[PDB]
Amino acid sequence: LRWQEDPEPEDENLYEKNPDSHGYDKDPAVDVWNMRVVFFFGFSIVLVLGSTFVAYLPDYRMQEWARREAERLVKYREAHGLPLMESNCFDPSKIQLPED
Amino acid sequence: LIRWTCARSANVYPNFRPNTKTSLLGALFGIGPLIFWYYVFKTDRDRKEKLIQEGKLDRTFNISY
Amino acid sequence: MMTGRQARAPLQFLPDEARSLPPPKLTDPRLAYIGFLGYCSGLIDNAIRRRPVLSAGLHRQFLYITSFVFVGYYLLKRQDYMYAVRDHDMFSYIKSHPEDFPEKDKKTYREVFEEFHPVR
Amino acid sequence: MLKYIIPTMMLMPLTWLSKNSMIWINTTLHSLLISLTSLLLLNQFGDNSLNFSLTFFSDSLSTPLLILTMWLLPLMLMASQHHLSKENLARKKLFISMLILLQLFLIMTFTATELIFFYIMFEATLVPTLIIITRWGNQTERLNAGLYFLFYTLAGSLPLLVALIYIQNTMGSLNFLILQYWVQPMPNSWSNTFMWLACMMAFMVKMPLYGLHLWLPKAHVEAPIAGSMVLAAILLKLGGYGMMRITLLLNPITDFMAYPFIMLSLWGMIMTSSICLRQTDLKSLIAYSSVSHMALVIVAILIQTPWSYMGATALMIAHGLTSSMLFCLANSNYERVHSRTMILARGLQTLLPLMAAWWLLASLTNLALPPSINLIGELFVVMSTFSWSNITIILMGLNMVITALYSLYMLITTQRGKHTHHINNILPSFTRENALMSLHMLPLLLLSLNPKIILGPLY
Amino acid sequence: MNLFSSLTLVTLILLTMPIAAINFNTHKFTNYPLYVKTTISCAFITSMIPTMMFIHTGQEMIISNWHWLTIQTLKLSLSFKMDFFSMMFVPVALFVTWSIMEFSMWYMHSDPNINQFFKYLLLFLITMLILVTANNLFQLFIGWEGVGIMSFLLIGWWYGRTDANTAALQAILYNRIGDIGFILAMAWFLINLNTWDLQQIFMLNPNDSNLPLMGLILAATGKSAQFGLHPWLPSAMEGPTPVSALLHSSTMVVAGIFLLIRFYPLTENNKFGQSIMLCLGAMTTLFTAMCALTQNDIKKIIAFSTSSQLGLMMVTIGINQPHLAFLHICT
Amino acid sequence: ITKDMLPGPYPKTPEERAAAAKKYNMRVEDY
Amino acid sequence: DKRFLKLLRFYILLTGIPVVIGITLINVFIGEAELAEIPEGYVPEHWEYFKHPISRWIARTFF
Amino acid sequence: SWDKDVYPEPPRRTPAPSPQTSLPNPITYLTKAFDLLVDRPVTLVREFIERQHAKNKYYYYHREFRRVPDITECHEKDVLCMFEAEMQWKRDYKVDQEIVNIIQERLKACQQREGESHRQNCAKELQQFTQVVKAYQDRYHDLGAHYSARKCLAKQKQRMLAERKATKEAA
Amino acid sequence: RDHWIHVLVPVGFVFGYYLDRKNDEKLAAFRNKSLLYKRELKPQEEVTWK
Numbered sequence A: 001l002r003w004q005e006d007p008e009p010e011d012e013n014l015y016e017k018n019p020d021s022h023g024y025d026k027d028p029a030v031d032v033w034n035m036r037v038v039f040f041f042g043f044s045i046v047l048v049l050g051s052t053f054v055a056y057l058p059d060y061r062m063q064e065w066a067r068r069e070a071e072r073l074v075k076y077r078e079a080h081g082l083p084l085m086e087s088n089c090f091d092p093s094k095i096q097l098p099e100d
Numbered sequence B: 001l002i003r004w005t006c007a008r009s010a011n012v013y014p015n016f017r018p019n020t021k022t023s024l025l026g027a028l029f030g031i032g033p034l035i036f037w038y039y040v041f042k043t044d045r046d047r048k049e050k051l052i053q054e055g056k057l058d059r060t061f062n063i064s065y
Numbered sequence C: 001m002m003t004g005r006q007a008r009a010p011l012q013f014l015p016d017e018a019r020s021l022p023p024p025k026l027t028d029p030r031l032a033y034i035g036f037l038g039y040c041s042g043l044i045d046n047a048i049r050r051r052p053v054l055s056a057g058l059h060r061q062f063l064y065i066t067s068f069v070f071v072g073y074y075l076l077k078r079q080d081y082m083y084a085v086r087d088h089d090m091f092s093y094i095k096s097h098p099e100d101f102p103e104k105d106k107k108t109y110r111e112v113f114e115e116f117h118p119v120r
Numbered sequence D: 001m002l003k004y005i006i007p008t009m010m011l012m013p014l015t016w017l018s019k020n021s022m023i024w025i026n027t028t029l030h031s032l033l034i035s036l037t038s039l040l041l042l043n044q045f046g047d048n049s050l051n052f053s054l055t056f057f058s059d060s061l062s063t064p065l066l067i068l069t070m071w072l073l074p075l076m077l078m079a080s081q082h083h084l085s086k087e088n089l090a091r092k093k094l095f096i097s098m099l100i101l102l103q104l105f106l107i108m109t110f111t112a113t114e115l116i117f118f119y120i121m122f123e124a125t126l127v128p129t130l131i132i133i134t135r136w137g138n139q140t141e142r143l144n145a146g147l148y149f150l151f152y153t154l155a156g157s158l159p160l161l162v163a164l165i166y167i168q169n170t171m172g173s174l175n176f177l178i179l180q181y182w183v184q185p186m187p188n189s190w191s192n193t194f195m196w197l198a199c200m201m202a203f204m205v206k207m208p209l210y211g212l213h214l215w216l217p218k219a220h221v222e223a224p225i226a227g228s229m230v231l232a233a234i235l236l237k238l239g240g241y242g243m244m245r246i247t248l249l250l251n252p253i254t255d256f257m258a259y260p261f262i263m264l265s266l267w268g269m270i271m272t273s274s275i276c277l278r279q280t281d282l283k284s285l286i287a288y289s290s291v292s293h294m295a296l297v298i299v300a301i302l303i304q305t306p307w308s309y310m311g312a313t314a315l316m317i318a319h320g321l322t323s324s325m326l327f328c329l330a331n332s333n334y335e336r337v338h339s340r341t342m343i344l345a346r347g348l349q350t351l352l353p354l355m356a357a358w359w360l361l362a363s364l365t366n367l368a369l370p371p372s373i374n375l376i377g378e379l380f381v382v383m384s385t386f387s388w389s390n391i392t393i394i395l396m397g398l399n400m401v402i403t404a405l406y407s408l409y410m411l412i413t414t415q416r417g418k419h420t421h422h423i424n425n426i427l428p429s430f431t432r433e434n435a436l437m438s439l440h441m442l443p444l445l446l447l448s449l450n451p452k453i454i455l456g457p458l459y
Numbered sequence E: 001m002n003l004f005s006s007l008t009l010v011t012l013i014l015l016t017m018p019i020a021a022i023n024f025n026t027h028k029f030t031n032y033p034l035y036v037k038t039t040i041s042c043a044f045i046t047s048m049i050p051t052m053m054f055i056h057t058g059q060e061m062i063i064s065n066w067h068w069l070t071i072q073t074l075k076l077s078l079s080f081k082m083d084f085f086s087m088m089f090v091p092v093a094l095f096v097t098w099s100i101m102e103f104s105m106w107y108m109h110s111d112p113n114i115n116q117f118f119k120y121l122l123l124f125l126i127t128m129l130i131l132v133t134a135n136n137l138f139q140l141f142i143g144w145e146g147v148g149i150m151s152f153l154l155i156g157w158w159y160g161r162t163d164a165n166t167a168a169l170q171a172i173l174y175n176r177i178g179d180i181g182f183i184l185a186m187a188w189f190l191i192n193l194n195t196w197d198l199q200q201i202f203m204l205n206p207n208d209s210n211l212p213l214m215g216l217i218l219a220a221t222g223k224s225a226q227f228g229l230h231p232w233l234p235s236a237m238e239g240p241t242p243v244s245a246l247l248h249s250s251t252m253v254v255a256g257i258f259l260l261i262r263f264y265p266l267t268e269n270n271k272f273g274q275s276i277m278l279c280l281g282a283m284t285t286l287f288t289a290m291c292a293l294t295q296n297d298i299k300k301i302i303a304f305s306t307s308s309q310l311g312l313m314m315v316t317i318g319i320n321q322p323h324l325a326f327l328h329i330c331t
Numbered sequence F: 001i002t003k004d005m006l007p008g009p010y011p012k013t014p015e016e017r018a019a020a021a022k023k024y025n026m027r028v029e030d031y
Numbered sequence G: 001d002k003r004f005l006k007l008l009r010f011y012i013l014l015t016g017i018p019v020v021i022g023i024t025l026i027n028v029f030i031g032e033a034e035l036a037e038i039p040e041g042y043v044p045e046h047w048e049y050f051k052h053p054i055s056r057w058i059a060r061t062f063f
Numbered sequence H: 001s002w003d004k005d006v007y008p009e010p011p012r013r014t015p016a017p018s019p020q021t022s023l024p025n026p027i028t029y030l031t032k033a034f035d036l037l038v039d040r041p042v043t044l045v046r047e048f049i050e051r052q053h054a055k056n057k058y059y060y061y062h063r064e065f066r067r068v069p070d071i072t073e074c075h076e077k078d079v080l081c082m083f084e085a086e087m088q089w090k091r092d093y094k095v096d097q098e099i100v101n102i103i104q105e106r107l108k109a110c111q112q113r114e115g116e117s118h119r120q121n122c123a124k125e126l127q128q129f130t131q132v133v134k135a136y137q138d139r140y141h142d143l144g145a146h147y148s149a150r151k152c153l154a155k156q157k158q159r160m161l162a163e164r165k166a167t168k169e170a171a
Numbered sequence I: 001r002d003h004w005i006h007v008l009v010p011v012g013f014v015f016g017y018y019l020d021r022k023n024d025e026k027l028a029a030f031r032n033k034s035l036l037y038k039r040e041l042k043p044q045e046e047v048t049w050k
Ligand SMILES: CCCCCCCCCCCCCCCCCC(=O)OC[C@H](COP(=O)([O-])OCC(O)COP(=O)([O-])OC[C@@H](COC(=O)CCCCCCCCCCCCCCCCC)OC(=O)CCCCCCCCCCCCCCCCC)OC(=O)CCCCCCCCCCCCCCCCC
Pocket: A048, A051, A052, A055, E009, E012, E013, E016, E017, E020, E065, E066, E126, E130, G012, G013, G015, G016, G017, G019, G020, G023, G024, G025, G027, G028, G031, G032, G052, H041, H042, H044, H045, H048, H049
């Protein structure tokens, strides 16, 4: 024969001793307070107020500013006859070149 | 069913023997496509870079990449 | 490396010029970490003798914390002293050998030419 | 970042001093409070990163990874409290302490300003993960799987240690903020070739690269549910985060060193997806799908265009949520039938209709249904690889067929057809399980409304 | 202006309101199918006003109302194109869907999941009007994949049947093979034109439009079940008769034809694309009508009928008559 | 489930072939 | 399943309805700001560069 | 509203309704019903809310970044100055991106508004679009995901060397 | 306190937040000294940021 071993325990059903079990614990008061903690601090706090926070971020990575600033610059240079964007990012007067 | 899944997963390597057929099939289906797609994509990108640095490829409105 | 510096006054843990250095504060985070190591030593000492881990031997846990803070304060003084000696010898050697440490001309990027490598 | 490090450390006395019926509820509550506080990282700027100190900083790459990391701990606590209900109390507290310690290593992995502190936290993440797999895994093979997970990572990463200390000696620093401004072009040589390999292969193992992926369908299968969630949702993304930090230093040599690995990924995402067509183990099917999705992130980092980095960080966040939800669904069946065989329990929509709706939504986000951020990352990587080479769309599009085919076959085998007659322990879905599914899926669908926070440093 | 765009968006939001009603339920509904049928009747009546004032003046517009996502130079906005194609196809689809759902209130009367059936059928209608009112390729891809997934869920309605799951996965397979070409088209237009919007695609008007039009033809071959990607539309008769009647006769299956009709400024200048469309449509309308001659399942015969008529639609696109093709859709 | 009901190596001796056929619940003539 | 969906909708609406009512009260009674030119010599605070009141509250309070 | 010169609109010319038939169009009846039942109550609610806005009026500002020295006049490996130059360059890159977005909005609005004669009537918008895309492509294309002011300066110097060699070999 | 354990994580937040603010005063080398943001001090003000 083989050694001294406990037999395989059965898988428990949380609905037999507690038909209103939420799956958290076998103590029903602990189970229901675990449910309320998960649903309040997960859905009522992080999801709702978190989506409110993400929805009202103060110009996340300043895109809106960059629209409005662009709305300045075009409006500055539609008038003065300047081209809307130079192809050179830096002034060629302040660039030394390697001669040849 | 347990025997089927243990054959399909766990018994594969302990009953593997490297020989002629397994080496030719593992090098044919293992690195053959790697060599193939390497030379296809390298040829396409060398052709593309050679067109771009000569001013031949129409990259006019291409400012997203 | 610095074996000749601490050889004219041998076996001094803290020399006299270490007193010219500011000592570590008693609220040093390194010293508080060593106190935490003492507290963990007290907890392991209660655990290996099967005492109640947080409750038993508060005099013993407090002597663990006290001994690690006490030893670690001097260890931090010696650490700060040796890095101070390191920088002092570095700077005196740089000052004493200007032929080896030239002041390099910092060129601006309008003159500096770098090869561009396009990602495409 | 010390406003996130100290609450994560205070979760240790919070979990060791709680009452025996209270150690799940308190940790879940306060980890949700830490995850609520994690949104203060969203103070990101168009020009500068959010640079807290000499040690810690956060740009828009690390910020979604940090919010996902701090969000995954309550979900791991919810997932792992049923199957550890019969556990000893001290071992249960040690399990929770390993998850807390892993989160503590992860949040200062992603915020390490200096790259050797990144390496130390990046390799400190092995020890809680290894202990969790080899201690609370279910089957025999967890010891072997822990060995594979350990010794692929360390064999890839101990060259990375030498490489980072070499950059430390050459440049004088491993500050990422300094190395943004002192980076030198890395010329073509054999020295720089093995420099590139030593910088990249540790993260290739972490992604995983195809061919190096053999640790993953063991380590993600032989683990408990919290281990699979943190492995497939966060720990595969350390590789992508590390590549996006380290390819700054590897130019212009990457522009031809990437060519084999791109092939290994572009063919790899064809193979591993195809492997998901013929897997019997559902957890292994989710594992090979993880390899298939992370191959796109490897390609997008190695082609190093802006659209590719945006799609790669979107696809990493989206795959984190999706694959974590899929592992939780596979556990929701495995807690009932006690076998990971996918053909065993069929027709489960006849018995669990709301859970079948969760399976449906997870499989639709798995197959990159628009406008989910799964599809946003998928589509942007496809755009950037089309700009890389116009032929790759074939290998993309064929993948986008097979990605559909295993995502619905998994839905058809598990949930559809006639149910298995001899299985009669299929309980109704507990409120904990559907709570876990909703906390996976509702953030994933809300991020479709505002995807710009998960698009990375160059939105 | 203020009437046109208002009732335009009121049609779509009115369709989305019973989805909120079925998702916010606690009770057993007092005839939710009657509620959805009344909703679609009213949506048809609402959509007839912008149709009448398009018959009056020819009033087209664009509602780019919600800025969604700017990828550095690609501004994806929630953009709705009210032109001739939307103004005619939206009331026809609403009228047909209203008839299909009053049919479904009888044909599916014994079904205990009838509210799920009307939920899925309304979600199909919402995604199809997302498809046909779209102004950029991303939102059109949303409607495209949406009608593909609602096709999956409505073919595999009796999910215990193996053949329904098999035909649904078949339909998804052929549609994703078409989606390869659709994403090829989106990729070409983004890389070469920096846009997914239809207006910039039509204004730049490229002459090297071989590859994107081949991608769009592959997308239409997937979606409209042309030759090579045809058999899923006869296989799709496994779903209920309102599924085979709304989705697989009139509304979803014309989306590939509608996609090629939508890009008529590009097909009118590509004779090679017109030749490929003409040959593929003639091949499809021959082959499916020939297969229809000997079938005995009546839904298979009518499915080969509608695939033959889709092939005829592809023919009349291929002879540079896109408006006759769209008239044949609405007919 | 136990080890000698799991799949094993390739059978060569006829008693090993018969033990395999008994393991997979089929005849030796059909194995 | 019905108990879960009732609890899900309840714990969403529990803070969702007061936040929607509060956002309505802010948009009606507090109100969206108006774009002005910077005066001469005046240094605006960093939260005075944002338009919505909740965004100004976030930029003043936390960021 | 917005600035009517950066987003220009041509003058609307609608024809006077000249009905030839004897049947009444339903569109005028529906226009009056929309004016009564919809436009007036929406107008009243908006006037109520706007009075509530005017009861407490406060202002937000456009942030003005003064120009700092760019990457050319920063010394090599001098992080305190080249950091400021890099932040300046990144803000300019984001703003140039939105300039391209403005010109794309102009082109698409012109195409829809002109309708069928869009190919003739939108030549100026097409020309401005081609110029601004050529400028953006010369300035920022092919830099990579690890772009910087140094990358853009190196691309500009390579382009200027190519232009100088092409000029000199043509003389 | 009957619920002393429910302040271990929030106080550990605030203290941590406190230390973050305390670190900012050690990184105040270039306060009102950068070329972008340097300006004259307004009256009743001693530092630009804290
Ligand atoms: C009601 C219950 C609703 C549900 C509650 C529970 C919801 C669940 C929990 C949610 C928890 C929070 C989650 C985070 C949300 C945070 C808020 C947020 O993100 O807001 C964003 C966004 C911006 O809000 P904001 O930044 O605060 O305001 C910006 C303004 O510049 C500044 O604001 P303003 O001052 O300019 O705005 C004024 C506005 C105040 O603004 C608000 O209240 C906006 C905040 C509402 C947020 C609601 C979000 C909840 C989700 C809504 C969507 C799902 C609803 C359920 C399903 C519906 C069907 C789909 O004033 C009014 O509301 C009054 C106007 C009333 C008009 C109607 C009646 C007029 C005639 C009356 C005649 C009778 C009386 C005459 C005499 C009167 C004498 C006094 O707000 C919205 O998007 C509001 C929702 C409605 C948008 C338009 C809807 C139509 C769009 C149609 C085309 C597009 C769709 C096409 C689809 C096609 C089919 C496929």
